[PDB]
Structure formats: structure tokens, C-alpha cells
Amino acid sequence: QCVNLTTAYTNSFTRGVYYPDKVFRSSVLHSTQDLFLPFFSNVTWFHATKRFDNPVLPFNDGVYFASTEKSNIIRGWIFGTTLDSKTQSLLIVNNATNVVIKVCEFQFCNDPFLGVYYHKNNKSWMESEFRVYSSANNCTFEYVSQPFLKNLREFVFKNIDGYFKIYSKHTPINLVRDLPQGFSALEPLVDLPIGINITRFQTLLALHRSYLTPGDSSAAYYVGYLQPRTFLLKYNENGTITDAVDCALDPLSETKCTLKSFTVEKGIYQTSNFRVQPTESIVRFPNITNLCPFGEVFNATRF
Amino acid sequence: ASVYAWNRKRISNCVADYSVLYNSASFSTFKCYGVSPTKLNDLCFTNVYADSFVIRGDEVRQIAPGQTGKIADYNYKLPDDFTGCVIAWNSNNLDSKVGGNYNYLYRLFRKSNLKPFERDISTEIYQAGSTPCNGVEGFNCYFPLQSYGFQPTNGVGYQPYRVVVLSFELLAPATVCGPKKSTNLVKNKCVNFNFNGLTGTGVLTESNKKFLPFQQFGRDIADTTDAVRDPQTLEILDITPCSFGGV
């Protein structure tokens, strides 16, 4: 069954950076080109009388996802295209004991969710039923591993060369409204051999039973998008990325990348080139309409 | 599968003996690109894809890098930097019947060429002229697919061939290795080595580098391997060159 539930920006700062590969480096500044969340970009802030808005978002070239909660409301995500039984979709769900990742032709609900209730005797929250999809078939992939969903959880989702790559970080915070400032790189979580087309995704939330009453009365996260950017990453003595420069952020960051350093000395540096780009395409061919007699060659009676 | 709708099989986390296939007498074509067929068992890959389909004899040459034609352009395209092996054999005794086997289709018309490993299985009417077809075939409006109609009496060029293309991916830990027997790990000596496909010469010592759980090897400022994770013990080893210098 399905339930019909449908009835702001923050600063990304210097977060959303992940280890670009699986190579150990130390005490070195490494320049890499990959899909990263641009520094100081506009990250959309979602908040799912009753009001419910947990929309399907574009995947674009990859997604930066973050949440700040101690209630374990965010349980998973749906990644796909039409998000119905017509095409294959990737379903990632966390629960009490493990993470289940499946690829099937899922017939997803418009407002997919996991039910949770407060057990009056145990005095704790417990799982009830899934209301994510009405049916699933033609399953091609299944994977099960360890669980990972003032507590900031960050994820990066990429879909490159058949691999659905997930990076993650778990950091304690003292913020309520905005994401924290400072630098912390996300580590590879899993490389999934999924091999599917993804253009849209949706967040799976655990909804309290009390919200499912028939009356009109009785879950925040951040989404950014990755871009093809050049980053200068600083690896410390233990091979941890502790800082980074977005080479396209501003003229100083560009200088820092050019000089392969996080510091710049007094002076004037040649860092880039300027060029005006064309806005139109002008085609001027001879104004003739007669066609070339090629057919007369191909359909000749005799060769 | 039909070539217009070729079937891709993903192979991983296994031992790949390619000598069984290469030394077989049962294949008519076995052409490798980017790799020698006799060195395959010494290599490790991060993934192998086995793409299977049926085409007619004359079209077997189109299953290669740098080719053009109805198959190369509209059905199954291989990249110019393809690494892998194209294996084919005559299947006239399997895929042909009296009266013609019309279960094998190929794409005859398309708006543009396919990208490498693109799989187009649409059946939308192809517009050859300037006038919209509106889903109706007729003059200047063609049904994009056609059958081979394989018959047991056809000449070789028109007999069915079963083609399997093994693409070798080299990203990522290698998961598909040849059937090579491992040796004991030796440290504090000048040795040749091969760590999950990573070859070289040098001295292996215990590393004090803080490798993360996902990292398989490291590199110095020269961007060359200077440390590896042993694929069996998960021990981190530093690699230095064997003593050398001018004389």
C-alpha cells in the first residue's frame, strides 16, 4: 500500500570534499579533477497542522547529501529515473541491524516512507511496516552490509562507469541551522556495481505513527550538486586530507592552485587566460538549390 | 541475444582462466586488443564484461576498434581504446533453420552512430525524409530493425556467428585474476614482485604508513608506487629500489 502525504538555502562552505581515489598519499599537495561540491555554493535545505514535503530531486552529475539529527529519521534513498516499474531503480535502506541495497523494477509510492512507532512497554521506537513501494520484480542486484544511518551525517553519491559510489562521514556538531565550517573529507563507503541510469532521487524518512492519524494535526536535510572542478588537496603526515582549494572559487584560489601551494607570497602571478566566448553560429553557404546528380551515377543502366 | 539488443554479463570476484578459451579449437575468431592473449593469465582486472550476440559471418570484422558499418555504427560499438578480446564461432548448426530463422535482428537505420557500449533497443520509425512519420511507416519512413533470416544453406558470410566480447577494465582493487599460484612473502631482500597485478622490482619492508581501510597502495611525490597492501594478509609494505648507483 501507499499513503498520500504531500500537502531555504545554506552555505556549503568548504565541505563536500571526498577522497578522489584509493591511493595513499602523505605530506603532499595533490591536484585532482573530479566531481566535487563547489565551495560556498547554494545548498538546498529541506524540511519534510500537518505539512509534508519530501520531493523528488534531480540527480544531475552527482549529489551531496547531509543531515543533522539524533532521531535517525533518514533511513535511505531512492535513485532512478521514472521511479516506477517501467525501469530499474536503486533502493538503499538502513535499519537496526543492516543496510539493504537492491536494484529492481520498483513501483514506488509518491510519498515513500518507513513507519516507526513508540513501543509503550519497551519505551523505545520500533519499526512497523514499509510504505516505500507497492511491488518489486526483475531484481538484478542485492547487497547487504553494516548500518550507517547534533550529529552530522554526510554522503556523496556518484554514478560513473557503472559504479554507484558512496562516500560518507560522521561528525558531531554544535550547530542547529547551518552546516559547520571547516574541512573534513568523506571516505569511500562502498563501490556498487549497479550499472543503471539515474536522473532523479528521493529521500526515505521514518515517519512517526502519530503523523498517520486521519486528522489534520499531530526531518531536515541538505542537498547540493557536484560539478567538474579542479581541487588542490592537502594530505597531512597520516594521509588525511585536512584542507582543500577550489581552483574556480576566486582569483586567489586560482593563484594557490597555479603555484601548488596553500600560501601565496607578495607579487603578481600569471594564473589564467581570458577570452570572450561566441554567442552565435553564423553559417553562410552559396544560395543554390539544385541537387547533385549522384543518383544518376548509382542507378545507371550500364556500368 | 540479437545484436541490436546485445546481452551484457558482469564478471567479478573470481579466477579467470583465459587459456581454456584461447587454446580451444572451437573458435574461428579470437582477436585481442590492448592485451596479448598469451599474457591474460598473468593479469588482474577490476572487472570483466562478457557481451554476447549473434551477427552474420561477414559482419564479424565489424566487431573491432576503428570499424564502421551497420553493426559497428547502429548495434554494437567498440571504443578506439578498447581493451579486451573478441571471440566468435560459426553457429550455423544452432541458429539456423529451414525456412529461415527470423529471431535475430539488427538495427539497419538510426539517426546517429552509437557511443561505445551503447545499447539502443527502441523500435521507433526512422525518418529518412523531411516529413514526420508520426509512428507510421511508409515512404521515407522505415522500421529500424531487420532480420538476418539465417538459413542452413547460406554461404559462410551469411551464416550466423555467436560473438562474445570480453572487455577488460583496469581502474579500485582488482577482482578478476588469472590462475596464478602465489608464493611466500619475502622481506628485506631484493626481489621481483607482483601484488594483485602490480609488478615491479625492489625491496619489501614493513610500512609505518597510516593506510586507510580502503586504500590499496600508496605513491610518493613522483606519482609512482612506493607502498602496497598485501592482498592476502592486508599487511602494508613499503617499496624501495634495490641498491644502485654510478660506478
Epitope: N299 | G100, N140, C141, Y142, S147, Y148
Partner: antibody, heavy 122, light 104 residues
């Protein structure tokens, strides 16, 4: 190239007739199968065609709405079903082969092979 | 379109030459003009296509020519087997049209 049609049929007005045509000696789906009618003492009249690869059809405005063409590639056979038969449908029906519309040298503009005529009396 | 053949009936001795004409109410591409031969009790067979090209198996005694709205079929020497009904056929507007036929 051979085209072999079913035997003669006798029908009452309002009845339907289905005439088959089994093809051999060529790639069945490589050609369009056309049907042409010839009433006694009359000339040849084109009815329509079917493209076996997709079972796509086109009919003359004269027969459109009465005739349905189908095919089965597994037995390389084409069928023409003419419904609501009238007394003026008494004719010899032929199946004929022609190239598809994508033929460069306009082999679709004519019929190069014909089956034996099948007489239907109404 | 209307395809009109003439004469409705043609009669001459074996060994002689016969000319069969087909006229169109509108211009017809030479590529779309064909001639057929139908013997008594037999299905039509293709003789000429593309106005002038002989079909496979057709004797060089048969030839065709023409353009626009005037096409002909020529039998240089008539044999006993040539005394049949001939048709002209046209393609256009996604339709196939036959003439009324003429008897030799």
C-alpha cells in the same frame, strides 16, 4: 523465389475470407507482401501491403476498414482477411513481393514475384 | 491517377513487332513505371520495371521506354507465348495503380 497461396474459397455475402501466402527462397522479412485483386474480366487492383518485420500495414482506400493483413514469420506466411464480403468481391486474389520503401533503386515501386491466383466466390 | 493503355486490343501475326502504349493523367517518374504480362489461367509476371529495365528471366525481345505521361512496351518479334494481356503499372502517393490492360 516461390509464393504459394491457399486454395479457392466460396463464401456467402457478409462472410469473411482469409487467404494465406507461404513464401520461400528468400528472406521473408526483407520484402513487403502485397495483395492484388482481379475480378473476372477486369484488370489488377492493389489492395494493400504488410511488412512482416513489424507487421505494419497500408491499405487502399477502397478496402480500408474491410481488409486486415497479418503475417507469421516463423512459417514465412502472409495472410489477407477480407471481411463483410459482397457479391462484387468475387475475384482472383494474388500475393506479390516487392522491396521495402528503403530500397535505394525503388524496388518497392513494382511487384517482381507473384503467387498463383486464389479464387474467392461470393 | 489514371493509367490508360492503348489500343484496348492489339492483333498481328507472330514474327512481327507490336507496340503497346500507356498514358498517364499526370507525369510519372520513369523509375515508377512497370509492365506486366498475364497469360490465360496464370498470375501476372513482371517484364519491365523502371520504364526500361528487364526483369530477371525476361528475353531481350522485350524492351520499354518513355517519360512524363507517355510510356511504351515493345515486342520486337512476337512468339506464340506473347499473345497475352499486358498491363502498365505506376507507383506514387504511396499507392500502386494498374492500367485496364490490353490484349495482344
Amino acid at each position: 523465389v516461390q509464393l504459394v497461396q491457399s486454395g479457392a474459397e466460396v463464401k456467402k455475402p457478409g462472410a469473411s475470407v482469409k487467404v494465406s501466402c507461404k513464401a520461400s527462397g528468400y528472406t521473408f522479412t526483407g520484402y513487403y507482401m502485397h495483395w492484388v485483386r482481379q475480378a473476372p474480366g477486369q484488370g489488377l487492383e492493389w489492395m494493400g501491403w504488410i511488412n512482416p518485420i513489424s507487421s505494419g500495414t497500408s491499405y487502399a482506400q477502397t478496402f480500408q476498414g474491410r481488409v486486415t493483413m497479418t503475417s507469421d514469420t516463423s512459417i514465412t506466411t502472409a495472410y489477407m482477411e477480407l471481411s463483410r464480403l459482397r457479391s462484387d468481391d468475387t475475384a482472383v486474389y494474388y500475393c506479390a513481393r516487392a522491396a521495402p520503401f528503403y530500397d535505394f533503386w525503388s524496388g518497392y515501386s513494382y511487384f517482381d514475384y507473384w503467387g498463383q491466383g486464389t479464387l474467392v466466390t461470393v | 491517377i489514371v493509367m490508360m493503355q492503348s489500343p484496348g486490343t492489339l492483333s498481328l501475326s507472330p514474327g512481327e513487332r507490336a507496340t503497346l502504349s500507356c498514358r498517364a493523367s499526370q507525369s510519372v517518374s520513369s523509375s515508377y513505371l512497370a509492365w506486366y504480362q498475364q497469360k490465360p489461367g496464370q498470375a501476372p509476371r513482371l517484364l519491365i520495371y523502371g520504364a526500361s529495365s528487364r526483369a530477371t528471366g525476361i528475353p531481350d525481345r522485350f524492351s520499354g521506354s518513355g517519360s512524363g505521361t507517355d510510356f511504351t512496351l515493345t515486342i520486337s518479334r512476337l512468339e506464340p507465348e506473347d499473345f497475352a494481356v499486358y498491363y502498365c503499372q505506376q507507383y506514387g502517393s504511396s499507392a500502386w495503380t494498374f492500367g485496364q490492360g490490353t490484349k495482344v
